[model samples]
Target: EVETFAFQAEIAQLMSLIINTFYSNKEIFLRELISNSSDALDKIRYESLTDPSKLDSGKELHINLIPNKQDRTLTIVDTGIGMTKADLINNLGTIAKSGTKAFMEALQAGADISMIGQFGVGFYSAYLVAEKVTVITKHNDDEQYAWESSAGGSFTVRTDTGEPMGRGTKVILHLKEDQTEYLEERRIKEIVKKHSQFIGYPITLFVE
Candidate 1:
């Protein structure tokens, strides 16, 4: 059965603060997403060191960025550890589950955390440019699922009956009307090089 969850009471205000405060530069969303993809890849690789069987899927570690000009969608796919149903709710639905309070406190205290992705709210940065976001993920321990939201208070999670992804996650952003710059190949390449050139995984951009 599909499940739905609502963001907490303070989420609206917090989202406003995050968008205006942390994401002053709109292109920073790409950087945050690529960093998150790297983190997921790192986790799976670390686990495979102890359990060699985890690599049975035969998927290579990499990130693919595909921009669809016709549809105005930007897709980021990664061969990395994906999330389960519970993970969808906890990681994406609630700030408390995401350790956002600590991050906010640190920011308020003027702490010198170099990476904004460290706060776990990095995923929401996608909303800066997209009106809607869809996440499709498959985990070895759970069935494949899709999570979707419009950065509104509520999000829905449902089982994905499509062809299996082998492993890892895909995030598709439906760009906002004014955010068309992200659809340009040159702009995307510049953003990647500026923020994720040394990211340890091969990031391929696909365009027509």
Candidate 2:
């Protein structure tokens, strides 16, 4: 069974802003995603400091990028804390902080531009390049599930019975017609190095 939910009214408005405002600079999509993956890994690592069991004892933390020109897909896999079904709905469906008013105010006032993710809309930025975005994730406390959206106001979530990712998340981007550059090895590496080199975990781009 698949569950569908609408992006909160404010979040839907924010998505419009993201698509139109940042469409010209789509490379930052990779940077924002990697930053998010790094943050997840950091959270689990920090938790492991006191509760060592929070991390899989044998898993080495890393991020993997697999780009497929044949399918026009770019997948990012991370060994980190994955989200549960509720987490998916909450994190992806609605902006965690206040509603759309704050975002609009920021734009109107021309506030510090870096405050974009202050409302947790970073992940939605992937829509800048991907016609559709799919996330498969598994957490220690919850079963594996898949969430998908085409940057529409609504998204769907369903159980995933396929092979598990051990304990992490996998994000697959179905590239837009003009976004095929993201599937090139050279371009991927350049973006990773340029924006995500400082990330703590190892980020590997798998190329054929």
Candidate 3:
């Protein structure tokens, strides 16, 4: 089992900046998250070709969004390689050194800023509409774990009591009141078709 730790101060500040300033089109959050899910599914499926059981849990590649009007929450569920305890802290917590520092330096020197999501932190876009976020995941190797965070400093990871469901992850967003535009199925479908229509994966939107 892997352990957890706090994010570096620079990373925390970078997250804050991303949540506050970087995202202009609020609806882009859903597109970004769904695109991420699609990519994860593709990765696992390709890996499965070499090792049969690598994708024994989930053979399908798709993205599903469930919007709850009663709870005012939006849930994004995917059948992809779920995160382990360490992945939550490292991939989601610490900023990966995938050239993000150099990209930001260039932007500060008047370079374009379109490459922000190209780095690994596209998932952080969830913080824009989510007051609180819960990530429930089951990996192929590790037992199921839940990661909870409120955007800035601290986060918690806990074990799951149920059987792993198809080697995937579910990200539930407790949507803020002002961010209710994401609660509509029509709005979500529009956004998905707009940004990721050619992604070649099934995207489903759930609403009630």
* Highest TM-score scorer: 2
Residue 200 CA displacement from its true place in model 2, Å: 0.7
Across 10-111, the per-residue lDDT of candidate 3 in tens digits comes to 556656766677556677677778877887788888888899888767678787889998899899999888888778767654455444565567668875
How much is 197 displaced in model 2, in angstroms? 1.2
The per-model lDDT (C-alpha) reads 0.82, 0.80, 0.75
For lDDT, candidate 1 versus 2, the one ahead is 1
lDDT of 2 by residue, 84-164 (tens): 988888854445436356757887887532455564556767877888999998887788999988866888999998876
State which candidate, 2 or 3, has the greater TM-score: 2
Better of 1 and 2 by TM-score: 2
- List pairs with backbone clashes in candidate 2: none
Query: Which candidate has the highest lDDT of all?
Result: 1
lDDT of 1: 0.82
RMSD of candidates 1 onward, in order: 2.6, 2.2, 2.7
Query: Per-residue alpha-carbon lDDT of model 1 for 137-159, expressed as tens digits?
Result: 98888889999877557778999
The TM-score values for the models, in the order shown, are 0.88, 0.90, 0.87
